[PDB]
Structure formats: structure tokens, C-alpha cells
Coordinates of C-alpha atoms in Angstrom, one line a residue:
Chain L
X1 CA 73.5 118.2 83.8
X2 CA 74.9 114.6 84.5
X3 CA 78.4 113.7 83.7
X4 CA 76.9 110.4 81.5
X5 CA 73.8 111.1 79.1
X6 CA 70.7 108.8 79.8
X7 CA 67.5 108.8 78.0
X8 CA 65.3 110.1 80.3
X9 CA 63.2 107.1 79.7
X10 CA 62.9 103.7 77.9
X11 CA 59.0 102.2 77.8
X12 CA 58.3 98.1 76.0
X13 CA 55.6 96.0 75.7
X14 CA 56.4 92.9 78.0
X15 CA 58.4 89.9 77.0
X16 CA 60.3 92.6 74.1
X17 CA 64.1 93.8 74.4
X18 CA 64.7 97.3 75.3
X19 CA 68.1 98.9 74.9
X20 CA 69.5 102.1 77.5
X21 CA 72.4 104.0 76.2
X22 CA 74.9 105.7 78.3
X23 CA 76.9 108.5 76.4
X24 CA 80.2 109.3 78.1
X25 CA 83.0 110.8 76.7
X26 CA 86.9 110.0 75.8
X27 CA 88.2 110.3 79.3
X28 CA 86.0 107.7 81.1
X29 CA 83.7 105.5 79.3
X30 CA 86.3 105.1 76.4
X31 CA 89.5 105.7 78.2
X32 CA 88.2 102.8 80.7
X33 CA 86.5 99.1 80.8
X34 CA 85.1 100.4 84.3
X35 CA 81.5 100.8 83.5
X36 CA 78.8 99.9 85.5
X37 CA 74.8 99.2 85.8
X38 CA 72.7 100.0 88.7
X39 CA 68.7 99.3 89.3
X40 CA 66.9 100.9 91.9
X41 CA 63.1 100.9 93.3
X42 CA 62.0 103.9 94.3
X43 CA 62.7 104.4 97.7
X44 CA 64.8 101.6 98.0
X45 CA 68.6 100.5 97.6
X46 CA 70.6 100.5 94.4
X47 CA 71.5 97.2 93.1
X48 CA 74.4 96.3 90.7
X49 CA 73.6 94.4 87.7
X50 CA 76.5 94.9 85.4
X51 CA 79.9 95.8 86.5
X52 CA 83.1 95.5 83.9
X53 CA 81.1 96.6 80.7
X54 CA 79.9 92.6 80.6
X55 CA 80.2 91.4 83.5
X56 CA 77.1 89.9 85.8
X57 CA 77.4 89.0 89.5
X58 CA 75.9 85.6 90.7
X59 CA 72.8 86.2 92.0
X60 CA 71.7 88.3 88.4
X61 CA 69.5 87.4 85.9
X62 CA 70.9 86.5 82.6
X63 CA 68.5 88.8 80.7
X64 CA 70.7 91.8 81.4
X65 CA 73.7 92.1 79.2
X66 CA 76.4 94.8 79.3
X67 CA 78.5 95.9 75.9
X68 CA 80.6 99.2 75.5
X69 CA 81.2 100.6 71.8
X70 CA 83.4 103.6 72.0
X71 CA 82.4 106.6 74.7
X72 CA 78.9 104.4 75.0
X73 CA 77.9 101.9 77.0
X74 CA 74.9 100.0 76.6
X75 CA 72.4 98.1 79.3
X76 CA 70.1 95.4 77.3
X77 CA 67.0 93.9 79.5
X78 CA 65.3 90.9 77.3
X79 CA 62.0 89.2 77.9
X80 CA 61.0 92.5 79.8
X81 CA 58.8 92.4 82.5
X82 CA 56.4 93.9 85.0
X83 CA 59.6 93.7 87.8
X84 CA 62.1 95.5 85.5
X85 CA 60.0 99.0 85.6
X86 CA 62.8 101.0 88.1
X87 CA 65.4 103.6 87.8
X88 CA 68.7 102.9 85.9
X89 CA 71.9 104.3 86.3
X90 CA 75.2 103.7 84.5
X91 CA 78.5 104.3 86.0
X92 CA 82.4 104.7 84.9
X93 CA 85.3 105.7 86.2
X94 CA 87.6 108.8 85.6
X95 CA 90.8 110.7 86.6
X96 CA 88.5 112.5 89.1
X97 CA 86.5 109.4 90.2
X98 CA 83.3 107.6 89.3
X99 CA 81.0 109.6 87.2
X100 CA 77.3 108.4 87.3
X101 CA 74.5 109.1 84.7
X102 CA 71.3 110.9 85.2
X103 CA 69.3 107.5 85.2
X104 CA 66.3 106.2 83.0
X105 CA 63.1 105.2 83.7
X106 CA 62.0 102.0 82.5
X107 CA 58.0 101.4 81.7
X108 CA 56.4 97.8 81.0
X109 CA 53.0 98.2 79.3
X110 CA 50.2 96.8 80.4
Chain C
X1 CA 96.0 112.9 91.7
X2 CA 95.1 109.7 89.5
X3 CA 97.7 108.0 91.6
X4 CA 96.1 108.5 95.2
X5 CA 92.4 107.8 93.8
X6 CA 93.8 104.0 93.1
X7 CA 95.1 103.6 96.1
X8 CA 91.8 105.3 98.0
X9 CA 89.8 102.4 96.7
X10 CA 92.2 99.7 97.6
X11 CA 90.2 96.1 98.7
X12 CA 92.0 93.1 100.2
X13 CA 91.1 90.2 97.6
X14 CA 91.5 86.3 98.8
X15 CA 89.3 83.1 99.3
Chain H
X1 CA 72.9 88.9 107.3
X2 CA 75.2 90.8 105.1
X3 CA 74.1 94.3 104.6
X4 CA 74.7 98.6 105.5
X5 CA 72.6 100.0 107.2
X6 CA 73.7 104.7 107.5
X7 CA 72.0 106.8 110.4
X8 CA 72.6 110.1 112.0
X9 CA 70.9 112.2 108.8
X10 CA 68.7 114.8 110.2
X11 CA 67.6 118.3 109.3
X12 CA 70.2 120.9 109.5
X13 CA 70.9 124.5 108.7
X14 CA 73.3 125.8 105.9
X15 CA 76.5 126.4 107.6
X16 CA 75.8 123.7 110.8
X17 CA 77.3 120.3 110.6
X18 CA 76.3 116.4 110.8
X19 CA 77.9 113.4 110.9
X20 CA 76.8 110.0 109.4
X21 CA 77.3 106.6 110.8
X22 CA 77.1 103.6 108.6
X23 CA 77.1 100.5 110.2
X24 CA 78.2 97.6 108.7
X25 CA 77.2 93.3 108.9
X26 CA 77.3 90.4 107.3
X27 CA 81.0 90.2 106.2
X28 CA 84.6 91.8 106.8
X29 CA 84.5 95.3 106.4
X30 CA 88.5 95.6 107.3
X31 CA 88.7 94.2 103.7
X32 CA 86.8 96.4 101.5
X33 CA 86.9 99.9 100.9
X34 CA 83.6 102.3 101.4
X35 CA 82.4 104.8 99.5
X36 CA 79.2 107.3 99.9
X37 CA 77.4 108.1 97.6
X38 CA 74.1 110.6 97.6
X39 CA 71.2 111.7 95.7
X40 CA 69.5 114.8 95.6
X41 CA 65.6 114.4 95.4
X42 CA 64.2 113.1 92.1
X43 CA 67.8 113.6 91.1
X44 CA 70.5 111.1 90.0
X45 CA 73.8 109.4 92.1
X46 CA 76.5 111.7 92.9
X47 CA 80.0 110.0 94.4
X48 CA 80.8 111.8 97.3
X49 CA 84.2 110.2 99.2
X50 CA 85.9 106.8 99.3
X51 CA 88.4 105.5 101.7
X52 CA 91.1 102.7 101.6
X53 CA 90.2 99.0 103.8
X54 CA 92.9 100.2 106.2
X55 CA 91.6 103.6 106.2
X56 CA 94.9 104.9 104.5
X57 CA 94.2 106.4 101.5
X58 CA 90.9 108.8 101.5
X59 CA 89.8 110.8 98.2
X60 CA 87.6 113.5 98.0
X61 CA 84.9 114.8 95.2
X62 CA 85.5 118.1 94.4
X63 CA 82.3 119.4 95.8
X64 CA 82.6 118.3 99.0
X65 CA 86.5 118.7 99.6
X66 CA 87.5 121.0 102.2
X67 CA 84.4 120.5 103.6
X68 CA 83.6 116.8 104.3
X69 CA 85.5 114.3 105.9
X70 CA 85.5 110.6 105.8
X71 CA 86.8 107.9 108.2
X72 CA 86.6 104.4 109.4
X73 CA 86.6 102.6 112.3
X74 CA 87.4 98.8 111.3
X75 CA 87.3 97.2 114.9
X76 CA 83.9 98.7 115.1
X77 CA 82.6 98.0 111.9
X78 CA 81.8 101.6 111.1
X79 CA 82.1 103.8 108.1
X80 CA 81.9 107.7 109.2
X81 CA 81.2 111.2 107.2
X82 CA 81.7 114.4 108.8
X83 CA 79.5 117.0 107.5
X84 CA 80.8 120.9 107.9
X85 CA 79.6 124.1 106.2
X86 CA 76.5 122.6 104.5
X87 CA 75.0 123.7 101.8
X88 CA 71.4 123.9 100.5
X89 CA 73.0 121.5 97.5
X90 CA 74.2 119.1 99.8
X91 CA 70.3 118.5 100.5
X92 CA 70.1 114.2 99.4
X93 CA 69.8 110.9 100.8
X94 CA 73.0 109.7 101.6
X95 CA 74.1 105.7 100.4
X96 CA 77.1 103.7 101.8
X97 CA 78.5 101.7 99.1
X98 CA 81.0 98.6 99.3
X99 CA 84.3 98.1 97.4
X100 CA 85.1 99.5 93.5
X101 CA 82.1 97.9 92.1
X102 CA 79.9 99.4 94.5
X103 CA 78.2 95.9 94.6
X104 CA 76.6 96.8 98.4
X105 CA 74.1 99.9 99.5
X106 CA 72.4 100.4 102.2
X107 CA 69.0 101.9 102.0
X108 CA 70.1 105.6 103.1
X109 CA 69.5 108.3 105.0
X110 CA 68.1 111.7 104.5
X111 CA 70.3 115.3 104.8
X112 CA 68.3 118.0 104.5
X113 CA 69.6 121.4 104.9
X114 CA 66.9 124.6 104.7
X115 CA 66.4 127.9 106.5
X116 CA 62.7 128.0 107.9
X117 CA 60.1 126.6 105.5
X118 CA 62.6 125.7 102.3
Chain X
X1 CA 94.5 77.0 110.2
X2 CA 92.1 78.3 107.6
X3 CA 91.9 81.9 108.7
X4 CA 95.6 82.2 108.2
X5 CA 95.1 80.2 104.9
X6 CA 93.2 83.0 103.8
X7 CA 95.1 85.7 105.1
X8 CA 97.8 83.9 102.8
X9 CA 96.3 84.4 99.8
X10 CA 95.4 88.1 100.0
X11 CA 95.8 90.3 96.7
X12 CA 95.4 94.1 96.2
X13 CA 92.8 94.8 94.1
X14 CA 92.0 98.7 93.3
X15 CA 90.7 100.2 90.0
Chain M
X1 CA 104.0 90.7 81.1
X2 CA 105.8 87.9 82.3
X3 CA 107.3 85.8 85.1
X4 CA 110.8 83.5 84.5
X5 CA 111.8 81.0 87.6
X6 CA 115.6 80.1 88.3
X7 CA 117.9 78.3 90.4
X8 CA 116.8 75.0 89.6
X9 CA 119.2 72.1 89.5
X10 CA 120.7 68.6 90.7
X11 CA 121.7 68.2 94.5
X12 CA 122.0 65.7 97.1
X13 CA 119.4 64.7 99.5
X14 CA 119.6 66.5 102.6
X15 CA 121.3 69.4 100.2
X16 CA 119.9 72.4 99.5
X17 CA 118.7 75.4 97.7
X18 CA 116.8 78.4 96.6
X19 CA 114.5 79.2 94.1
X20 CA 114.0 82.7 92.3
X21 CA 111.2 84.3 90.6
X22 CA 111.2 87.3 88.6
X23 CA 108.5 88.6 87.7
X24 CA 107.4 91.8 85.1
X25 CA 104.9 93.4 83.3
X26 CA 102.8 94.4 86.9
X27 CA 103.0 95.5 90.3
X28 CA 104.2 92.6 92.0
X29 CA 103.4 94.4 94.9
X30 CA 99.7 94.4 94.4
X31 CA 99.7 90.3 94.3
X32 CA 100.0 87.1 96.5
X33 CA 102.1 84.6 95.0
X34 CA 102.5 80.4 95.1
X35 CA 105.0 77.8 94.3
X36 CA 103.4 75.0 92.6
X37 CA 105.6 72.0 91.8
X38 CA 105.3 68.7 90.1
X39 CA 106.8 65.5 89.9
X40 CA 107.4 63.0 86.7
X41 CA 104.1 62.7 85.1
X42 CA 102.3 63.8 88.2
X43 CA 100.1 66.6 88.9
X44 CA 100.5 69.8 90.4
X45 CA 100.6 70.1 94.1
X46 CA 100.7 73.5 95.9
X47 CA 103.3 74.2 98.3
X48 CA 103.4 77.5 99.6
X49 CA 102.0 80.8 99.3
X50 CA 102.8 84.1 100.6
X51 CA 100.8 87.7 101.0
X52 CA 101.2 90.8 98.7
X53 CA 102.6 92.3 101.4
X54 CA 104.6 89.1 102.8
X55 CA 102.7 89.4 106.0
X56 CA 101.3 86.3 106.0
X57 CA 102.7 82.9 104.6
X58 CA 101.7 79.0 104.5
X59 CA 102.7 75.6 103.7
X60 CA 101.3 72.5 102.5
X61 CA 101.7 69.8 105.5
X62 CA 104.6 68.1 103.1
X63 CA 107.4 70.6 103.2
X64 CA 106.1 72.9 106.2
X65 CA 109.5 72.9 108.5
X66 CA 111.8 72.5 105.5
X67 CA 110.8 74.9 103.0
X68 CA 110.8 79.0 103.4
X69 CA 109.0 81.4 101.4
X70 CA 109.5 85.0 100.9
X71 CA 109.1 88.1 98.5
X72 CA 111.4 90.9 97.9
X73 CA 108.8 93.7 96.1
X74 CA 111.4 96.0 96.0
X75 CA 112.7 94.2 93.5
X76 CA 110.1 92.1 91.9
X77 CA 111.1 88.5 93.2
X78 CA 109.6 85.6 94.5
X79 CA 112.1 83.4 96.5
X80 CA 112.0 79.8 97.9
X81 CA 114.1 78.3 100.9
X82 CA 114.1 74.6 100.3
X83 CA 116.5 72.6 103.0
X84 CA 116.8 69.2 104.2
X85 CA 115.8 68.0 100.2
X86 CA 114.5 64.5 99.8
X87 CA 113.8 62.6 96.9
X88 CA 110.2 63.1 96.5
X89 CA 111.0 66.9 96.1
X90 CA 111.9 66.1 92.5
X91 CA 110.0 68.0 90.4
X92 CA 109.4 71.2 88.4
X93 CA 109.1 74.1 90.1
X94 CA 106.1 76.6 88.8
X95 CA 105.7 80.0 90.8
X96 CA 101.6 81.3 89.6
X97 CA 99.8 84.8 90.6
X98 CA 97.0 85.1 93.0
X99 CA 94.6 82.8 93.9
X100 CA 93.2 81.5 90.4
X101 CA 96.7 81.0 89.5
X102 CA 96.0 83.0 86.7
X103 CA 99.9 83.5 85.7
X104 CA 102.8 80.7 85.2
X105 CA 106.3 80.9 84.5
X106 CA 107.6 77.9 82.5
X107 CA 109.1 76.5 85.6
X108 CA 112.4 75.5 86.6
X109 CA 113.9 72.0 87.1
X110 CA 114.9 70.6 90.6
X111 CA 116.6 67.0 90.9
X112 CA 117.2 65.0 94.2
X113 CA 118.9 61.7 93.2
X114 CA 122.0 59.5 94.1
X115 CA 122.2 58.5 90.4
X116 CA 119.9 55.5 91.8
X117 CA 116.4 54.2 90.8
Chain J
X1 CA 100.5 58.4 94.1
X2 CA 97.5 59.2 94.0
X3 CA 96.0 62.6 93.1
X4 CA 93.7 64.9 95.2
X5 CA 90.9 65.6 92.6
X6 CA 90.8 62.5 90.0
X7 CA 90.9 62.7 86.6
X8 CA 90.8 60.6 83.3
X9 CA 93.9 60.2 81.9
X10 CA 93.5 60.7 78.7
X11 CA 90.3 61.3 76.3
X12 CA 90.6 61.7 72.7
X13 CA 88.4 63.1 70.3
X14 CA 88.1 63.9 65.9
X15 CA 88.2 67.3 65.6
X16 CA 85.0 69.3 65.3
X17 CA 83.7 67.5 68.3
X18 CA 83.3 67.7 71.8
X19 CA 84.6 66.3 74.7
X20 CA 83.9 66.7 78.3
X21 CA 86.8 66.4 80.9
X22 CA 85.3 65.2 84.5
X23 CA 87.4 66.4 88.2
X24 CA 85.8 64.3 90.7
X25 CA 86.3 65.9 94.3
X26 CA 85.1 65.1 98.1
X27 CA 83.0 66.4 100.5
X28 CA 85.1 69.0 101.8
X29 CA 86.8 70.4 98.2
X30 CA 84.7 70.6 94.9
X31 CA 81.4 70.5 96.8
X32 CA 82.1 72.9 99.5
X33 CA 83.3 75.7 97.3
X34 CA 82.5 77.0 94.3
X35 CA 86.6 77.8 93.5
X36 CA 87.1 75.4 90.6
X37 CA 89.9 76.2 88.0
X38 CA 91.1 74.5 84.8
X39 CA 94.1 74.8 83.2
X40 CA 96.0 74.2 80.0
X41 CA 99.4 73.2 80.0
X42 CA 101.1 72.6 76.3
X43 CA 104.6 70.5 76.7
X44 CA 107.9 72.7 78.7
X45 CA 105.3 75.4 78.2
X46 CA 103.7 77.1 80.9
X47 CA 100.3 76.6 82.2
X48 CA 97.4 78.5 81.4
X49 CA 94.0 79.6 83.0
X50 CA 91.1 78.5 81.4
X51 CA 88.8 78.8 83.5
X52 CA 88.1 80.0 87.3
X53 CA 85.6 80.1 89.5
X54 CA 83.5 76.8 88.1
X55 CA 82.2 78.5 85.0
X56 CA 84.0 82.0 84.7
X57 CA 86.5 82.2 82.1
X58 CA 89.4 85.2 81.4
X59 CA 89.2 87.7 78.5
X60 CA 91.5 85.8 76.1
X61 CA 90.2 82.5 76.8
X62 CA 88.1 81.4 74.0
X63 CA 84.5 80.5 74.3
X64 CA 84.7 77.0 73.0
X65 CA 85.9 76.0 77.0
X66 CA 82.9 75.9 79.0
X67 CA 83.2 74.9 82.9
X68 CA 80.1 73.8 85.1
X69 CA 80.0 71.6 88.4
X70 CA 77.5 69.2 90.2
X71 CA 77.6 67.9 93.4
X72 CA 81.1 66.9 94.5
X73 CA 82.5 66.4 90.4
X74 CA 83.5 69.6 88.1
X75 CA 83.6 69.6 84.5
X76 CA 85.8 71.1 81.6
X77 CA 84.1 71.1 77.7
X78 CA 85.6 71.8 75.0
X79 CA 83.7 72.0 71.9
X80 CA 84.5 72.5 68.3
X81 CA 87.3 70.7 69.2
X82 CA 90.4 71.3 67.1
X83 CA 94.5 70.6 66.7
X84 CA 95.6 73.3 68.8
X85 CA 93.2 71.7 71.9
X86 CA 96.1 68.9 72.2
X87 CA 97.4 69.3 75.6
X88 CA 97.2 68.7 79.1
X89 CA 94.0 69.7 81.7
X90 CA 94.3 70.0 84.8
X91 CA 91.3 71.0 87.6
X92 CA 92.1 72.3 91.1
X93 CA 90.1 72.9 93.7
X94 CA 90.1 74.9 96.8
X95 CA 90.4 73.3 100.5
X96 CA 90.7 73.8 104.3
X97 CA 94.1 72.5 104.0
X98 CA 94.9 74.5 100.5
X99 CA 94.3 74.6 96.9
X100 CA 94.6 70.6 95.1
X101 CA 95.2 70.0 91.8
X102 CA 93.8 67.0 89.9
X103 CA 96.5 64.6 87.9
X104 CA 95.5 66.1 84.7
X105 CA 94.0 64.9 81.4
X106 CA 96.3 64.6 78.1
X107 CA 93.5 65.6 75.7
X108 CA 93.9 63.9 72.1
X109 CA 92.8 65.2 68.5
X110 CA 92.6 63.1 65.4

């Protein structure tokens, strides 16, 4: 079992807004602003999107957004398409170090 | 501890 | 040019040991500090180690403590982790990551640790 | 020169 | 979270005096830190800045020679050496936090003169 | 005198409105980094980051300052402009030699 809850998987239609939860708990995800989002290919590199809750590094599209309410965090992908079907993990921070989530699959229809 | 898990990921931040 | 790039993953037995290179380019690695992070097969990340830019401060999962080691070699450019008493759980690809956010992997390399067939 | 410019400016930035 | 300058006042060209910053509210440790100044309705100008761990300092090309900067994290303060004083050094003194400057103190007042103008 | 980065003196605007603050640079400051800062200074108060890094701005910085550069000349807007936006801006920049300021802009509402 993952220290952060994912859905297992997230599928849209293309050009729609889909919405990946990460549950953590009061020691990490609500005790800190330390929460991060990573996309990865399969069989390739992770890649940061999100790192801060909110924040976005340069070279990222503005179509993901990062927000926190509470123990969750949320990732939020608008005007979905074919390249955003990948792996995506959340991560926070705690007492013991950075706890990761198990990672959802993201599926564009078509 | 909490304490020696800061300083573990310690980076050196300029221009 | 700026990228990690880990070698020295190989097949191993439980109990036998390995030791991971991770080579870095592209920027000043004296600065940041590195972390490694692995994932078991069809499985999600798991934080394994982190140590300081100056290689002063190093801080340990609590799966792997007692048992791994990590180092750096900053006037080489090389991140290190020493592998003892494996396990058949410690079977994953292993990532080098760069600094807090970890905002730099490389592409990994595989640890695989069986008796015989699997 | 401007590597010690930079070295100047050098924060600690953990978690 | 706060920083407070001091040691500001009138003296002679060719005088000196030091400047002290103390700062709270953070690990001063953990931060480089500047002296920024400015003259009567002037901008700011930069003068020098010195590393977290007071390893490495520098100085704008104006006061390099004359002015000395230096920490003391044991005790959270910033300090500044400034001999040999000329006129142009009139100016408020601001001491700011890392490199966006993203933390001022109110400043302190510095005054070189011979009651002339 | 004469400042580093240049700057209108003053701009004033009726309140509700927008005004845009220029920072015009050289070859070797504004254009060859992306390490831009604005800051707002209130009278024997002290300054204040607005904005860092061209366009980034800090958590308590409100979203009516807006900071964007092109070419060798930065930028500051503020809109819904308002009585408590009376003050002084200044830009600085980064260079080889160190960080220059601009002479600032005393900002005006009606």
C-alpha cells in the first residue's frame, strides 16, 4: 500500500479537464506545502510538473495546475491531450522523508 | 531525526 | 548537456552486494544535493537515500538503513550507493534525482536480485 | 570576477 | 520576522564607521546578505554582499578598498566597515536578504558633510 | 547621476486603472538574464518585493502586480489600480559586475 492514495486511473475525452487526487494524511500533505507532481513515460525518466502545491517550473505547460485543500492535493491537466496519457505520481514531504503515491494512469480517448 | 533530514537535503542557492 | 545518467545495476543474489554510479553533467553538482530513488516493477517511487552538496549530512529510508550506503564524490562528479545484504524487495530500477524538488532524473538502472529462475 | 560574484551570493536552501 | 539596521549618523569625510544589522524571525545562518544604500532622491545601488557562511564576500567597484563586510551568525548580525568616508557616501543604508532582496530593514541614516553645499 | 536601469519618474493614474511601469536595461543586464525584481518602497518605510525573477511574484504579493520583459526593457503593471498603490517602484537587474537598481518610479493615484 502507498503512503499517498491515487486513483488507480483517470481516462477524458480530449481537449476536457481531468482532475487526480492525492490523499495524504495530517503529518505530510497537511502538516506541509511540500507537495509535488511527477509524469513519467513508460520506460522513461520522471519529470516534475508541479513542485510547492502551485508552483510550475519554466519549461511546463500552463495546463497543469497544482492546489492542496487539507490532507489532499490535487493535479488538474486542461485541454487534455493525446501526449498527456503517462503515469502520475504525487509527492510530499514528512518527518521521515518524502512519501510518494502509488501513481495514476491517465487515458485520452480516441 | 527531523532535524538531520533538513540538513541531508541542504542545496547551495545563488545566481 | 545537463542530465544523470546511473550504471553499475546488474543481477545479483539475495545477500551479495552492488554498487551504483551515477554520473552527473550539464551543471554543478557540488551545489545540489542527490537523492535515489527506485521503483519496483509496475510498482510506484520509493525514496531511498539523500545526501547533503558537501556530502555532510546523509539520511537514510528506513528500509534500506543499516544496509545501504550513500556517498559523493564532488570533484568527480559522481553520486554513489552501496548495496549490501539485498533483498528480493530491493528488486527496482534505480533513479538519481537532483536537489529537494527532485526536478532532475536520470533514466535508471535495473537491480534485480533472485535465486535461479525468480 | 563573476565566479566569485556568485559564490557571493550563496544561500542555504533545504526543506 | 524582521531585520532593524543601526549605527548610522553624521561624521567627517575621511571619518569613519560601522553599520549593524540585526536580524530575527530566521536562521540568519541559512542566508547571504547585502548592503544596499541610497543617496537623496537617488536609487538604490548595491554595495556589498557576503555568503551564508561568510566565506565569500564582494564589492561594488565604488567602495571596494574602503568598505568591509562581515557577519557574525552566532549572533544574528550583519556588519559594515566603512573608512576613509567621502561625501558621495551620503545615503541611507538598507541591509536586504538573499539574492531577490526579498527582506529590507527600514534603513539607517549616514551623513558625510562639512555643514557645506 | 545617472541610474543603471532607467526609469520614468513618475506616472500617475485614476484609480481603477492600469498603469504599466517600463526598466529599460543594456545588453549585458536585463537582456542577458532573466533576474528582474521590482520593488515597492512606501515613504521611511522599508522596501518590498514585488516581484522576482521577471514575472514571479511572492505568496503575499497580490495579483494585481504583473511583471513581464522584452528584449533589453522589463516591465511592472499594476492593474485595478488603487490608493494604497501610491509609492515608489523600483526595478533591478542582475550583472557581471552586480545587481543595479533602476532610479525608481513615484507612482500617483487620483
Amino acid at each position: 500500500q502507498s503512503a499517498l492514495t491515487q486513483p488507480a486511473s483517470v481516462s477524458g475525452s480530449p481537449g476536457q479537464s481531468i482532475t487526480i487526487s492525492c490523499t495524504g494524511t495530517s503529518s505530510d500533505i497537511g502538516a506541509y506545502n511540500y507537495v509535488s507532481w511527477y509524469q513519467q513515460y513508460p520506460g522513461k525518466a520522471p519529470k516534475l510538473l508541479i513542485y510547492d502545491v502551485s508552483n510550475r517550473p519554466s519549461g511546463i505547460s500552463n495546463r497543469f495546475s497544482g492546489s492542496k485543500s487539507g490532507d489532499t492535493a490535487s493535479l488538474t491537466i486542461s485541454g487534455l491531450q493525446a501526449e498527456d496519457e503517462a503515469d502520475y505520481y504525487c509527492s510530499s514531504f514528512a518527518n521521515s522523508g518524502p512519501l510518494f503515491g502509488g501513481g495514476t494512469k491517465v487515458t485520452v480517448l480516441g | 531525526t527531523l532535524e538531520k533530514l533538513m540538513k541531508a537535503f541542504e542545496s547551495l542557492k545563488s545566481f | 548537456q545537463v542530465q544523470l545518467q546511473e550504471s553499475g545495476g546488474g543481477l545479483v543474489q539475495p545477500g551479495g552486494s552492488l554498487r551504483l554510479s551515477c554520473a552527473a553533467s550539464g551543471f554543478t553538482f557540488s551545489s545540489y544535493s542527490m537523492s535515489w530513488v527506485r521503483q519496483a516493477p509496475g510498482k510506484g517511487l520509493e525514496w531511498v537515500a539523500v545526501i547533503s552538496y558537501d556530502g555532510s549530512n546523509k539520511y537514510y529510508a528506513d528500509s534500506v538503513k543499516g544496509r545501504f550506503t550513500i556517498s559523493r564524490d564532488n570533484s568527480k562528479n559522481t553520486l554513489y550507493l552501496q548495496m549490501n545484504s539485498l533483498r528480493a524487495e530491493d528488486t527496482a530500477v534505480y533513479y538519481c534525482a537532483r536537489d529537494r524538488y527532485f526536478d532532475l532524473w536520470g533514466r535508471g538502472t535495473l537491480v534485480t536480485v533472485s535465486s535461479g529462475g525468480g
